[PDB]
Amino acid sequence: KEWQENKSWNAHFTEHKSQGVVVLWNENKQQGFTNNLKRANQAFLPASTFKIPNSLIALDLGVVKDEHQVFKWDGQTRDIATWNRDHNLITAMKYSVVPVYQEFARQIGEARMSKMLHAFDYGNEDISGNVDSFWLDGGIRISATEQISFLRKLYHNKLHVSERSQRIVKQAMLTEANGDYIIRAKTGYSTRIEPKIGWWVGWVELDDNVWFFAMNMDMPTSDGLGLRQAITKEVLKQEKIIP
């Protein structure tokens, strides 16, 4: 059976006084699992998880030459200290540097952004709003299941951009690696339209399988942001995917 509900995972949200969904996909078995089939299919603003398609499009169009090209700080002091400094693609992804990605989106422009999101079958494919903010307060929406379908295409180099573009973005997604697993992922935090939600989307590479994941959770304040990873890892540990 393709999609299966595991209500036992709700204990991981309950135990943190949280509400959300975790979706897993077993690539070898071509089967998916979720605590909440309805919420797995509800669409939300992608917020910073949009850095994955934005990175791909920027590299494929040559807006970003490679993962070492330096994007100079514009000398405007912002809220997040790690943003007030020079970045390359690796560090801009790591510190989720919005102003770097805003400039990419402006250089890409509305016409190319729209065509590439259709080509990617990415969420509702709707870029209505400002070209440098639609993933934060515009028309674009994506579900946890639609994140999985996009990431599977990236993993297999099946997106309609160069293999090189896809390999570079997967490098930039690297989050954790040890002798047991590799996680390639991207966090997000949608705050401008209700409900406020946190995301964590990506995959776990094991020796002989890959488990795709997409989670979102209600995030009324920034206090709970560490639960995006903590809850996903509690589910991965339950299912014996990581130790």
Ligand X SMILES: *C(=O)N1C[C@H](NOS(=O)(=O)O)CC[C@H]1C(N)=O
Strands 197-205 and 182-190: antiparallel
Q: Does 177 bind a copy of itself (CB under 8 A)?
A: yes
* Residue choice 72, 208, 223, 243 for contact with a copy of itself (CB under 8 A): 208
Q: Is 48 an active-site residue?
A: yes
101 binds, among ligand X, a copy of itself, Cl ion, none (CB under 5 to 8 A by kind): Cl ion
Q: Does 223 bind a copy of itself (CB under 8 A)?
A: no
Nearer residue to Cl ion within complex by CB, 51 or 233: 51
CA distances from 236 to 9, 54, 104, 125, 171 (A): 10, 28, 34, 30, 22
Q: How far is it, in rounded angstroms, from Cα 109 to Cα 17? A: 41
Q: Are the C-beta atoms of residues 182 and 174 closer than 8 Å to each other? A: yes
Q: How far is the CB of 149 from ligand X (least distance, A)?
A: 20
152 is in an annotated binding site: no
Residue nearest to ligand X (CB): 48
Q: Are the C-beta atoms of residues 59 and 168 closer than 8 Å to each other? A: yes
Q: Within the chain, what is the greatest distance between any pair of CA atoms? A: 54
Q: How far is the CB of 83 from ligand X (least distance, A)?
A: 9
Q: Are the C-beta atoms of residues 31 and 4 closer than 8 Å to each other? A: yes
112 binds, among Cl ion, ligand X, a copy of itself, none (CB under 5 to 8 A by kind): none
Site residues (vs ligand X, CB under 6 A): 47-48, 96, 98, 136, 187-189, 191
